[PDB]
Curated annotation (Swiss-Prot), chain A:
This is Actinorhodin polyketide putative beta-ketoacyl synthase 1. Signal peptide: none annotated. Pathway: Antibiotic biosynthesis; actinorhodin biosynthesis. Belongs to the thiolase-like superfamily. Beta-ketoacyl-ACP synthases family.
Swiss-Prot record, chain B:
Belongs to the thiolase-like superfamily. Beta-ketoacyl-ACP synthases family. It comes from Streptomyces coelicolor (strain ATCC BAA-471 / A3(2) / M145). Its EC number is 2.3.1.-. Transmembrane segments: none annotated. Pfam families: ketoacyl-synt (PF00109), Ketoacyl-synt_C (PF02801). GO terms for molecular function: 3-oxoacyl-[acyl-carrier-protein] synthase activity. Keywords: Acyltransferase, Antibiotic biosynthesis, Transferase. SMART domains: PKS_KS. PROSITE patterns: KS3_2. This is Actinorhodin polyketide putative beta-ketoacyl synthase 2. This putative ketoacyl synthase lacks the active site cysteine. GO terms for biological process: antibiotic biosynthetic process; fatty acid biosynthetic process. Residues 1-401 form the Ketosynthase family 3 (KS3) domain.
Length: 421, 402
């Protein structure tokens, strides 16, 4: 059974909603600035891509705001937006056939740090004081509440779960939902991801391994994937949600088919928890398998939404994987990293990337890799630097890499191409 | 056909399958006061601790610095499961081996210490391992790297329902083309913050008598007792298994299913009954075929009543033996489902139903046939395993005798 996307919802830095989101990407401008959620002075990487979010304006009541972590607020806001755009009639829906697959790398990191200060008296006590125990503490300890929150918003009663595979969560959560619908475990799925990691503990853990950029003097150009002067990714927050359903059913109801997820696959490094080999062997195989399921030849790929975190090892890593899987076609296919503009929102980024591909497939414009000014010999492909590029897209590829060794890839094609499949 | 060829258990009442199975059949629990820190200053004080596990004796000195207690237990469990199945990762195609685990708390002990150093000393004191020792995917990635498994892998989070969901997720993967999949879960949150966090659940027993604190389905039920540990098991394609030379297994994972309860206030019925019937259909087996039900065993009155009611609706009141061996270990979150599965397979293999400890009086209201005291020798061939996760997660799994 085939799965398609009928609705999209996005909450990215400088992109509240698909319109603004797309306006930002095609404009090539960035949303990476100096961190304002707290004082970055004590840390190495003091820049991040922060999303302008107003919970009250989104429609959350007092209990919901006091209850849910920032990441769940983003997820739910996106699920609602996707539900709305899908046009899927709530009344005709059978809750027992509606599921949820939410991805998240660090989940409630923000609420944990907030509560940690009250419990420990700002790090003074190991034996925390239960007198300052939040009534929601358990739900920050065990993030399961995130998928639940979304399920309650959309009326889901089918398979509901959280996929947490590091920086590939955004892709694996959608892939999981695709498998759910294909296997017949659900007819409608609300899938996507969200992460709100801009918090001291996360920044400090990335500084420890120097994974993030130390370029604090020029925040607007801090994220520079594939660039010769790159020195790490830029920490970001964000979320995106999609409405997925049976292909025939979406056609039958006359829904708008934003795209068909014709292929998805994931494999592991079995190499190192954060390190990567230059060969890109595993990712190549992942792309091969995804293409195999999709039945689409490598030469059909019209664009590749890269991982492109901006770290030395990563960018060079996937470049090798592309040439290994796409062969010569790798050199004659546009590749670009939206992280150059929205930063790396960890588990959320994969979903934002899927949303970006869907938007590209429709508008026929390939988003550029901003800040790409100095070329790197190890990254000798075409990364569409600085300016967007007009191009007819029918079949696109998107991949991601995450701590733990995870390598995932997904193939997205438009309705036109799907109907011809 | 997906078989369970190898199991690895790390439980509060037994480090390893043999010790565990022995304690279960004998009703010995591994419950007691928390000694990881001073619990006398908190409302809840009892937990299922594993006290005979010294990481350095099971984990390579290289991994000790970067692993949380939960991960060390998972790696130990995983290794034992692979050799129990006589499976050599080095002798198998890397891409033909996957890893699917569930994780509820992640490396919380580890992250708590990193939070303290950050605000006590400063960001420069944060460990270079904090970046991957805490996140929920940690146990999948570490198991993957240690055994050179490169096939499709994942990590799921759904509180105590996750462990069963992980197993079902593995079944899906195997059926799509990956011959072997390591699956399971292990949790541990026995640090002051993790402890206080669990207490915030509002469902933790404040009893002081270890023999009478976790009493699912008992009229004196007053909350569950937290525990640390779990299980990892090796699942694989029937054909690939026999071809591998592995003709011996624990059982078959016949069917799986996950549902989610309606939002709070909807008044609509829970989805546990639906999950059960979905799992039975997937397995191609009817209610009458089930010989034993390993209940979630919430230990919280309102939840026990809900569960007893769903079981009754499917198999009829007192219509099928019900048991809750976790009374001997406590709730292990992502480890609970996996351990229940192991306990069920052992019951099928040994021809006896693992008994429930502690419970002495089951309310007529629940209408269930609970196995208490001694193991009941009914020689079951099909078992149903149930697990629920906080906020409404339901998970059911049907197993068959090999
Ligand atoms: Mg990508
Ligand atoms: Na013990």
């Amino acid at each position: 059974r085939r799965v398609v996307i009928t609705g999209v919802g996005v909450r990215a830095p400088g992109g509240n909603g698909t319109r603004q989101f797309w306006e930002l990407l095609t404009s090539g401008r960035t949303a990476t600035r100096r961190i304002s959620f707290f004082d970055p002075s004590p840390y190495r990487s003091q820049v991040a891509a922060e999303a302008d979010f107003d919970p009250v304006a989104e429609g959350f009541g007092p209990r919901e705001l006091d209850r849910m972590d920032r990441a769940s607020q983003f997820a739910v806001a996106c699920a609602r937006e996707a539900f709305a755009a899908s046009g899927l009639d709530p009344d005709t829906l059978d809750p027992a056939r509606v599921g949820v697959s939410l991805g998240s790398a660090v989940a409630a990191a923000t609420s944990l740090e907030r509560e940690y200060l009250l419990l420990s008296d700002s790090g003074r006590d190991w034996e925390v004081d239960a007198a300052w125990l939040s009534r929601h503490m358990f739900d920050y300890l065990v993030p399961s509440v995130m998928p639940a929150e979304v399920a309650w918003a959309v009326g889901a009663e089918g398979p509901v779960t959280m996929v947490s595979t590091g920086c590939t969560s955004g892709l694996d959560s959608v892939g999981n939902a695709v498998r759910a619908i294909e296997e017949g475990s659900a007819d409608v799925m609300f899938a996507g991801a969200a992460d709100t990691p801009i918090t001291p503990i996360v920044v400090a853990c990335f500084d420890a391994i120097r994974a993030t950029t130390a370029r604090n003097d020029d925040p607007e150009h801090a994220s520079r994937p594939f660039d010769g002067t790159r020195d790490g990714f830029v920490l970001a927050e964000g979320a995106a949600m999609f409405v997925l359903e049976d292909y025939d059913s979406a056609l039958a109801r006359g829904a708008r088919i934003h795209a068909e997820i014709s292929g998805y696959a994931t494999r592991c490094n079995a190499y190192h928890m954060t390190g990567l080999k230059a060969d890109g062997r595993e990712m190549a195989e992942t792309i091969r398998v995804a293409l195999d399921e999709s039945r689409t030849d490598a030469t059909d790929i019209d664009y590749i939404n890269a991982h492109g975190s901006g770290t030395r090892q990563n960018d060079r890593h996937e470049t090798a994987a592309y040439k290994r899987a796409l062969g010569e076609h790798a050199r004659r296919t546009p590749v670009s990293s939206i992280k150059s503009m929205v930063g790396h929102s960890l588990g959320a980024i994969g979903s934002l990337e899927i949303a970006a591909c869907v938007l590209a497939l429709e508008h026929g414009v390939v988003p550029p890799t901003a800040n790409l000014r100095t070329s790197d010999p190890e990254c000798d492909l075409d990364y569409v630097p600085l300016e967007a590029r007009e191009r007819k897209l029918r079949s696109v590829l998107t991949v991601g890499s995450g701590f733990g060794g995870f390598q995932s890839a997904m193939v997205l094609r438009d309705a036109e191409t799907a109907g011809a499949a | 056909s997906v078989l369970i060829t190898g199991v690895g258990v790390v439980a509060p009442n037994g480090l390893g399958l043999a010790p565990y199975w022995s304690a279960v059949l004998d009703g010995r629990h591994g419950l007691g006061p928390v000694t990881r820190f001073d619990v006398s200053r908190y409302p809840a004080t009892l937990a299922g601790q594993i006290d005979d596990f010294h990481a350095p004796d099971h984990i390579p000195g290289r991994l000790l610095p970067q692993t949380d207690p939960s991960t060390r237990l998972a790696l130990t469990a995983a290794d034992w499961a692979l050799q129990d199945a006589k499976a050599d990762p080095e002798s198998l195609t890397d891409y033909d081996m996957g890893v699917v685990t569930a994780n509820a708390c992640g490396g919380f002990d580890f992250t708590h210490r990193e939070f303290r150093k950050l605000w006590s000393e400063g960001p420069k004191s944060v460990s270079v391992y904090e970046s991957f020792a805490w996140f929920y995917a940690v146990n999948t990635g570490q198991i993957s790297i240690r055994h050179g498994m490169r096939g499709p892998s994942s990590a799921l989070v759904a509180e105590q329902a996750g462990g069963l969901d992980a197993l079902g997720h593995a079944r899906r993967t195997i059926r799509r083309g990956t011959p072997l999949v390591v699956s399971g879960g292990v949790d541990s949150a026995l640090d002051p913050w993790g402890w206080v966090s669990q207490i915030a659940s509002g469902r933790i027993s404040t009893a002081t008598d270890p023999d009478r604190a976790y009493l699912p389905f008992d009229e004196r039920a007053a909350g569950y007792v937290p525990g640390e540990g779990g299980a990892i098991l090796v699942l694989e394609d029937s054909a690939a298994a026999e071809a591998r030379g592995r003709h011996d297994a624990y059982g078959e994972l016949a069917g799986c299913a996950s549902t989610f309860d309606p939002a709070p206030g909807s008044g609509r019925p829970a989805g546990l009954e639906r999950a059960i019937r979905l799992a039975l259909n997937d397995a191609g087996t009817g209610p009458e075929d089930v010989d034993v039900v390993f209940a979630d065993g919430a230990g919280v009155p309102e939840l026990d009543a809900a569960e007893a009611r769903a079981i009754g609706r499917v198999f009829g009141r007192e219509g099928v033996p019900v048991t809750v061996p976790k009374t001997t270990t406590g709730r292990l979150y992502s480890g609970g489902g996996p351990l229940d599965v192991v306990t069920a397979l052992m019951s099928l293999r040994e021809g006896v139903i693992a008994p429930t400890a502690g419970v002495t009086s089951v309310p007529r209201e629940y209408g269930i046939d609970l196995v208490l005291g001694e193991p009941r020798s009914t020689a079951p061939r099909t078992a149903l395993v149930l697990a629920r996760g906080r906020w409404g997660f339901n998970s059911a799994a049907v197993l068959r005798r090999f």
